[PDB]
Amino acid sequence: MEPVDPRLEPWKHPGSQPKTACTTCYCKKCCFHCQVCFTTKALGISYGRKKRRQRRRPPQGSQTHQVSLSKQPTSQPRGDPTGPKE
Numbered sequence: 001m002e003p004v005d006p007r008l009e010p011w012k013h014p015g016s017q018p019k020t021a022c023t024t025c026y027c028k029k030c031c032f033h034c035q036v037c038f039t040t041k042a043l044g045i046s047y048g049r050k051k052r053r054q055r056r057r058p059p060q061g062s063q064t065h066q067v068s069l070s071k072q073p074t075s076q077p078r079g080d081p082t083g084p085k086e
Contacts, residue, residue, distance in 0.1 A: 001045050005055040007068045013043040013052075014079035017064040022047075023080050031065075031080060038066075038079025061086035 006015030014023050018031035022044070027034045042048045058064045065080035072084045 003044055003047075003049070003052040003054065005058050006039075006044075006064050006066070007056040007058040008043060008052065008054050010043070010052075011068055011074070012038060012078065013068075014039050014066045014077075015044055015058075015064065017059065018080060018082075031082060033081050036079050036081060 003013065004015065006013045006017070016023050018024055020026065020030035021035050022037050022040045024031045024033055024036045040047050043052060058067070058069060060069060062085040063082070065082045066077040067074050067084055072086070074083070077083050
């Protein structure tokens with residue numbers, strides 16, 4: 001599929017890195033919150049815009065969550081509640 005990897009210049013795409021309900025589930029199992037996705041409604045795999053033409057190497061070392069490789073603490077993590085480890 002086309003918008004899979006999380007690195008958009010129109011940015012709200014956490015995508016799939018702690019992968020369960022698309023991204024983040026359960027609170028105690030997959031990354032801290034009960035279901036906080038954001039990619040599933042707005043921007044990602046077949047979601048909201050559906051075919052956004054951008055991928056560009058985001059998991060380059062360690063973890064993505066909600067980053068896009070540029071200024072690493074990217075404001076607030078809106079879907080996937082953590083951020084970098086690179």
